[PDB]
């Protein structure tokens, strides 16, 4: 509350550390469904169904231009990528499996870097 604060957790390396995680996600062999925005002209149903599209290149641009206020808003966009994927793709599909795999990969790097 006013004039009453928990000890200051050092967030000065968060930007650099999110960038590293994102580099690792970009270079994963199963990243291909996620590297670029889904083409809303060429994929029937996507525009109407997926209210907030997100992909690694959009996260990269947001990160590089100071559009994440803190490390949690960064994680929320990464999770949005995978939540969108599960919304539109069957689990038993190459893309549905890719999204499960990448979500696991992310959540471990996230825990190991920050928890």
Q: Which two tokens stand for residue 112?
A: 């190991």
Hey, which CATH number is domain 1-115, 3.40.1710.10, 1.10.3720.10, 3.40.50.2030, 1.20.920.10?
Answer: 1.20.920.10
Q: Give CA–CA dist 58/35, Å, rounded.
A: 9
24-to-3, 28, 42 alpha-carbon distances in Å: 40, 6, 28
The experimental resolution of this structure, in angstroms, equals 1.7
Q: Give CA–CA dist 65/88, Å, rounded.
A: 29
Q: Please measure the distance between the N-terminal and C-terminal CA atoms of the chain and give it in whole angstroms.
A: 25
Inter-residue contact 35 to 101 (CB < 8 Å)? no
Within 13 Å of residue 18, how many CA atoms lie on the same side as its CB?
24
Q: Give CA–CA dist 99/54, Å, rounded.
A: 13
Helices (H), the chain: 14-27, 46-49, 56-64, 71-88, 94-114
Q: CB under 8 Å to 67, separation ≥6 — which residues?
A: 61
Inter-residue contact 103 to 91 (CB < 8 Å)? no
């Amino acid at each position: 509350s006013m004039s009453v604060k928990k000890p200051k957790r050092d967030d000065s390396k968060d930007l650099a550390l999110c960038s590293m995680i994102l580099t690792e996600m970009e270079t994963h062999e199963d990243a291909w469904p996620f590297l670029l925005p889904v083409n809303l002209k060429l994929v029937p149903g996507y525009k109407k169904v997926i209210k907030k599209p997100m992909d690694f290149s959009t996260i990269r641009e947001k990160l590089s231009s100071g559009q994440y206020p803190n490390l949690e808003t960064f994680a929320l966009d990464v999770r949005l990528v995978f939540d969108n994927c599960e919304t539109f793709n069957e689990d038993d599909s190459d893309i549905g499996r890719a999204g499960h795999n990448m979500r696991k990969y992310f959540e471990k790097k996230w825990t190991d870097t920050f928890k």
